[PDB]
Design a protein around this ligand. Structure first.
Ligand code: COA
Ligand code: AMP
Ligand code: CL
Ligand code: CL
Ligand code: K
Length: 661
């Protein structure tokens, strides 16, 4: 095809796989036909095991078919390992002087090169604080509410080292959203920081944590709080709250040097990550130890073709799966040199990421289509002042990338001497599932291209629910297990089977897709009422619930709409009680309610008042198709109105939307 972009010659010569698609397809075919041997050989080559699994030929067991029994997946069962030891200890002493993180703060005068040796010291100190001052035991839950600073990685690895289970709460979440997660995960300890800064905006962290802990205490939980000094005179509750500096001082000197490793079974839980579904409140996706460890690290190495002479920079936050797999765990297990950045691409100005690229000789950069589009809007002058000669791989994650942004990323940001890895995956898959690999994969802008090693995607007919062969469009599903797959939903396996295994034999992704005549996949987006807003998965029912907590609100309906920067924006239709004085202030207060309940990531982009009411059937069900079409200006595609109790409303909905948009 004419839209194919060939991999660069230089990347082809460097590739772990090889210089042409045949090289990839050789390994892929083996990884499907000899799936157990493939993963056993990868596992043996790339990771330390205290104890190996008993049989290379059977490293997985599973059931994808509800009629046979409960759904389950296990990998490397019988093996013993530790994630911290693989990310940190095994790299010493040879690499003690290698940089692990080139850290930069929001303020560009705040910088630190943190070596693997220094990370070991930091992690050993914290692990001992958790063990001997908090009595954190194997399997206990620990919450993290942290900015993108070295201590965030340190805390994730320390918890891994002692077998604690982390649940990371994105620093953008509100106090109520943090509290809900702490309660549901039953965390014994919260680790946070005094505060951070994003651009000119203060990011309170401990002050937010204070309200959240107060909420948890009103519900009878007892949660201790350990606070890192990032910027302060934060309110510290006596007996509950400790400064990390005061904890460090209570360590004996040899506890700055040694902390024993908890040796973990393969299916021991590593972390819980709360994720939005189509219904109900967000639920925690459960990842265990060995299979996730293997999958996240192996995708890191191949999807980005990471070598030891590469310098890697992922712009994603630890509050999301991308920062778990591709900021902390994956990169450090392969002993990568990474850039860790606390701030934003536009502070001090829009050259900031390019200043980081040139300063640290970044060769692999992993970011999001929404960020690329904002840089595009900002103007190319902010890119072209920077030396980009070291870049050779650029990655895109979290939402579909339009052809214009792809081309701009590669030919402006990467100066035309870069391969682009558009990686499709989700929280539930642990790691990349469909992705280009640099040097060996011809690229089609906008396509994730081919399945990762060991992955068998399919297109299911939305009607017949069987596999469709050849070029086809339908539901994207995976027909076989891979080591990184989530093992359950915390406390709700029933919902897990319902959500992902409604079609016996398959993992249902929740995404739509088209596979073309070359076998390349094109992901079309969620097929359920889940939005991807600036790359962030968020459920429409959660936003409606938050909107409806305002006392003036009678009812709301939330839909996504196309957005030229964010990919998808948040559109709110709502009705107020009779007599309400509707002003921009009131609308702003309803937005603030959403931001208090959830956080700024859920901020409504458009608020439309249904002066006559929402379109509902005679049974009271809101007809969401009308609202989706109206919010997108697709006035001609509204569809059926014959089941509306109130067909009079349709004219107003269009009229008002035209007024606004
Ligand atoms: O660009 P970007 O800031 O990187 O992403 P966004 O601007 O969409 O962030 C949306 C909001 O989430 C906040 N946010 C994003 N990442 C955040 C983080 N890691 N911690 C706290 N807040 C965060 C932003 O500050 C912004 O808040 P605002 O509405 O008060 O300005
Ligand atoms: N490369 C991509 N192309 C298209 N959609 C993506 C891509 N990566 C992530 N997504 C979307 O993001 C969802 C997962 O969000 P999360 O679980 O938060 O990582 C997927 O189900 C997709 O809808
Ligand atoms: Cl040990
Ligand atoms: Cl290497
Ligand atoms: K996403």
């Amino acid at each position: 095809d004419s839209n194919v972009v060939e991999p660069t010659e230089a990347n082809g010569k460097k590739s772990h796989v090889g210089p042409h698609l045949g090289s990839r397809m050789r390994i892929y075919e083996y990884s499907i036909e000899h799936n157990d041997a493939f993963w056993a050989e990868i596992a043996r080559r790339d990771f330390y095991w205290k104890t190996t699994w008993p049989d290379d030929q059977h490293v997985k067991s599973y059931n994808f078919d509800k009629s046979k029994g409960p759904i389950f997946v296990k990998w490397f069962e019988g093996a013993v390992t530790n994630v911290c030891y693989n990310a940190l200890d095994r790299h010493l002493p040879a690499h003690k002087d290698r940089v692990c993180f080139y850290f930069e703060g929001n303020d560009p005068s705040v910088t630190e090169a943190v070596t693997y040796g220094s990370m070991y010291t930091r992690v050993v100190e914290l692990a001992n604080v958790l063990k001997y001052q908090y009595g954190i035991a194997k399997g206990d839950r620990v919450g993290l509410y942290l900015p993108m600073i070295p201590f965030a990685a340190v805390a994730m690895l320390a918890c891994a080292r002692i077998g604690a289970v982390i649940t990371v709460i994105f620093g953008g979440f509100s106090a109520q959203a943090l509290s809900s997660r702490l309660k549901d995960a039953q965390t014994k300890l919260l680790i946070t920081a005094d505060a951070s800064a994003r651009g000119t905006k203060p990011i309170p962290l401990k002050d937010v944590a204070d309200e959240a802990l107060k909420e948890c205490e009103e519900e009878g939980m007892s949660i201790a709080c350990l606070v890192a000094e990032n910027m302060q005179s934060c309110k510290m509750k006596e007996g509950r709250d400790t400064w990390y500096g005061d904890a460090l001082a209570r360590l004996t000197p040899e506890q700055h040097e040694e902390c024993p490793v908890e040796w973990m079974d393969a299916e021991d839980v590593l972390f819980l990550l709360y994720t939005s579904g189509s219904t109900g409140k967000p639920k925690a996706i459960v990842h265990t130890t060995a299979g996730y460890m293997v999958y996240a690290s192996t995708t890191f190495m191949y999807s980005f073709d990471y070598h030891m002479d590469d310098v890697y920079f992922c712009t994603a936050d630890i509050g999301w799966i991308t920062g778990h797999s591709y900021v902390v765990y994956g990169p450090m297990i392969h002993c990568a040199t990474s850039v860790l950045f606390e701030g934003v691409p536009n502070y001090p100005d829009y050259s900031r990421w390019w200043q980081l690229v040139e300063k640290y000789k970044v060769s692999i950069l992993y970011t999001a289509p929404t960020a690329i589009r904002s840089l595009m809007q900002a103007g190319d002058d902010y890119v072209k002042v920077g030396n980009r000669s070291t870049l050779r791989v650029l990655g895109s994650v979290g939402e579909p990338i339009n052809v214009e942004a792809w081309k701009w990323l590669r030919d402006v940001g990467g100066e035309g001497h870069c391969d682009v890895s558009d990686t499709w995956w989700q929280t539930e898959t642990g790691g990349h599932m469909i992705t280009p690999m640099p040097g060996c994969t011809p690229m089609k802008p906008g396509s994730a291209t081919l399945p990762f090693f060991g992955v068998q995607p399919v297109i299911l007919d939305p009607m017949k629910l069987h596999e469709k062969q050849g070029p086809a469009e339908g539901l994207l599903a995976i027909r076989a297990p891979w080591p990184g797959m989530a093992r359950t939903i915390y406390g709700d396996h029933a919902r897990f089977e319902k959500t992902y295994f409604g079609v016996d034999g398959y993992y249902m992704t929740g995404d739509g897709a088209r596979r073309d005549s070359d076998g390349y996949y094109w992901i079309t987006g969620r097929v359920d009422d889940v939005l991807n807003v600036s790359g962030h998965r968020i459920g429409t029912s959660e936003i409606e619930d938050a909107v409806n907590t305002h006392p003036a609100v009678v009812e709301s309906a939330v839909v996504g709409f196309p957005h030229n920067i964010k990919g998808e924006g948040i559109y709110v239709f709502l009705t107020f009680r009779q007599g309400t004085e509707v002003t921009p202030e009131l609308l702003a207060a309803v937005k603030a309610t959403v931001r208090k309940v959830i956080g700024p990531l859920a901020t409504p982009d458009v608020m439309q008042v249904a002066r006559v009411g929402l379109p509902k059937t005679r049974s009271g069900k809101i007809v969401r198709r009308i609202l989706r079409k109206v919010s997108a200006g697709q006035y001609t595609e509204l569809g059926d109105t014959s089941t509306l109790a109130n067909p009079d409303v349709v004219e107003d909905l269009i009229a008002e939307h035209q007024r606004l948009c």
